[PDB]
C-alpha cells in the first residue's frame, strides 16, 4: 500500500486517492509576507490539563500517542475555530537528516520535524463522522528544530524501543502534551487536509510560528524506528513527510501582526 518510498510515495498517492490533487490539500508552504493578520481571529485556547494518554502505536507510517477522547478533557478552542475540538492523538513527521522532515514549510524553509496534535469537532459526535465534514478536524502543528533537548519529549523517546516495528503498541499513560508546546501561541491558519491517505479535506490547520527545540539524540531515536513489521528487512522510519502542495484558492491568515 501507500508509503513514502519511490514506488509508493506522495507522488503515487493520487492513483488510489484522487483527492490528492484536490483544492485544499496539505501541507503547504507558508509565505510569511503574503500571510495576513486577521483581527476576526479569537484568542487560541489550548486546554490540555485534563489530557489522558492511553498508549503509543507504531502504525507503519509514524507513531501515534493516543488519548481517551470519550469525554471533554483535552480540547482546542478559539482562534479560527467555532466550537470545541477534542484531542484524539498526536504524532510527528521527520527526516533522515536535520535539514528536512517537516511537512509545512515557512518561506520554503524545512524544519527537522513537525508535531501534529489531532482534534475532532465535538459537534459531530466522533472522529469518523467528523471526517465527513469540511470543518470536522483541527490539527495543531508545531515545528521541531535541532538544538537543546525538550524535557517534555523524553518520555516519548524512551518508549520508542518498545514499538520499533509496524503494529507494535505499548501502554503510555499519564503523558502530558503541554510539555511539547512552545512559549508563544502565535500561529498561521488555513483550511486544508490530512497529509496522509485518505487525504480528507476536513482540516482547519493551525501552525505555530515558534518551533520547539529538541536534541540531536532525541530525533536520532525517532530515526531508529521501522516502517516494516517485526521479522522483516529493516526499513528505517525516516522522511515520512509529504511535500508542500498547491495553495490554490486559499489565503493563509496570521494571528499576529
Ligand atoms: Zn501528521
From Swiss-Prot:
Q: What is known to happen upon mutating residue 118 to K/R?
A: Strongly reduced CO(2) hydrase and p-nitrophenyl acetate esterase activities
- What cofactors are annotated for this protein? Zn(2+); Co(2+)
Which spans are transmembrane here? Answer: none
Tell me what happens on changing residue 62 to F: Reduced activity
- Keyword field: Acetylation, Cell membrane, Cytoplasm, Disease variant, Lyase, Membrane, Metal-binding, Osteopetrosis, Phosphoprotein, Zinc
Q: Where is this site: Fine-tunes the proton-transfer properties of H-64?
A: 4, 59, 64
Q: Which residues bind substrate?
A: 195-196
Q: What would changing residue 114 to Q do, according to UniProt?
A: Strongly reduced activity and sulfonamide affinity
Q: Which residues form the Alpha-carbonic anhydrase domain?
A: 1-256
Effect listed in the UniProt record for changing residue 61 to A: Reduced CO(2) hydrase activity, rescued by 4-methylimidazole (4-MI). Reduced proton transfer. Enhanced proton transfer. Enhanced proton transfer capacity
Q: Where is this site: Involved in the binding of some activators, including histamine and L-histidine?
A: 89
Where on this chain does Zn(2+) bind? 91, 93, 116
Positions in coiled-coil regions: none
Q: What is the regulation of this protein's activity?
A: Activated by X-ray, histamine, L-adrenaline, L- and D-phenylalanine, L- and D-histidine, L-His-OMe and beta-Ala-His (carnosine).
One Gene Ontology term from the biological process aspect of the record: positive regulation of cellular pH reduction
Which InterPro entries does the UniProt record give? Answer: CA_dom, CA_dom_sf, Carbonic_anhydrase_a-class, Carbonic_anhydrase_a-class_CS
Phenotypic consequence of residue 64 to Q: 2-fold decrease in enzyme efficiency, as determined by kcat/KM ratio, and efficiently inhibited by chlorzolamide
Active site residues of this protein: 61
- Impact reported for residue 141 to R: In OPTB3; complete loss of activity
Q: How does it assemble?
A: Interacts with SLC4A4. Interaction with SLC4A7 regulates SLC4A7 transporter activity. Interacts with SLC26A6 isoform 4 (via C-terminus cytoplasmic domain).
User: Extra info from the record?
Assistant: Target of drugs used in treatments against glaucoma disorder and breast cancer.
- What family does this chain come from, according to its entry? Belongs to the alpha-carbonic anhydrase family.
Disorder noted: Osteopetrosis, autosomal recessive 3: A rare genetic disease characterized by abnormally dense bone, due to defective resorption of immature bone. Osteopetrosis occurs in two forms: a severe autosomal recessive form occurring in utero, infancy, or childhood, and a benign autosomal dominant form occurring in adolescence or adulthood. Recessive osteopetrosis commonly manifests in early infancy with macrocephaly, feeding difficulties, evolving blindness and deafness, bone marrow failure, severe anemia, and hepatosplenomegaly.
Q: Would you tell me the protein name for this molecule?
A: Carbonic anhydrase 2
The organism encoding this protein is: Homo sapiens
Amino acid at each position: 500500500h501507500w508509503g513514502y518510498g519511490k514506488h509508493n510515495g506522495p507522488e503515487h498517492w493520487h492513483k488510489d486517492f484522487p483527492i490528492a490533487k484536490g483544492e485544499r490539500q496539505s501541507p503547504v508552504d507558508i509565505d510569511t509576507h503574503t500571510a495576513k493578520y486577521d483581527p476576526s481571529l479569537k484568542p487560541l485556547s489550548v486546554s490540555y490539563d485534563q489530557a489522558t494518554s492511553l498508549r503509543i502505536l507504531n502504525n507503519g507510517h509514524a507513531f501515534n500517542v493516543e488519548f481517551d477522547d470519550s469525554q471533554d478533557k483535552a480540547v482546542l478552542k478559539g482562534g479560527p475555530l467555532d466550537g470545541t475540538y477534542r484531542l484524539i492523538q498526536f504524532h510527528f513527521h521527520w527526516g533522515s537528516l536535520d535539514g528536512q522532515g517537516s511537512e509545512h514549510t515557512v518561506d520554503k524553509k524545512k524544519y527537522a520535524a513537525e508535531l501534529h496534535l489531532v482534534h475532532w469537532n465535538t459537534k459531530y459526535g466522533d472522529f469518523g463522522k467528523a471526517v465527513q465534514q469540511p470543518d470536522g478536524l483541527a490539527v495543531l502543528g508545531i515545528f521541531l528544530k535541532v538544538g537543546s533537548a525538550k524535557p517534555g519529549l523524553q518520555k516519548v523517546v524512551d518508549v520508542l524501543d518498545s514499538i520499533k516495528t509496524k503494529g507494535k503498541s505499548a501502554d503510555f499513560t499519564n503523558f502530558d502534551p503541554r510539555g511539547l508546546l512552545p512559549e508563544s501561541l502565535d500561529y498561521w491558519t488555513y483550511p486544508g487536509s490530512l497529509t496522509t491517505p485518505p487525504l480528507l479535506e476536513c482540516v482547519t490547520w493551525i501552525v505555530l510560528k515558534e518551533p520547539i527545540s529538541v536534541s540531536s539524540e532525541q530525533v536520532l531515536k525517532f530515526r531508529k524506528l521501522n516502517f516494516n513489521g517485526e521479522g522483516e528487512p529493516e526499513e528505517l522510519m525516516v522522511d515520512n513527510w509529504r511535500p508542500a502542495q498547491p495553495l490554490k484558492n486559499r489565503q493563509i491568515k496570521a494571528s499576529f501582526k
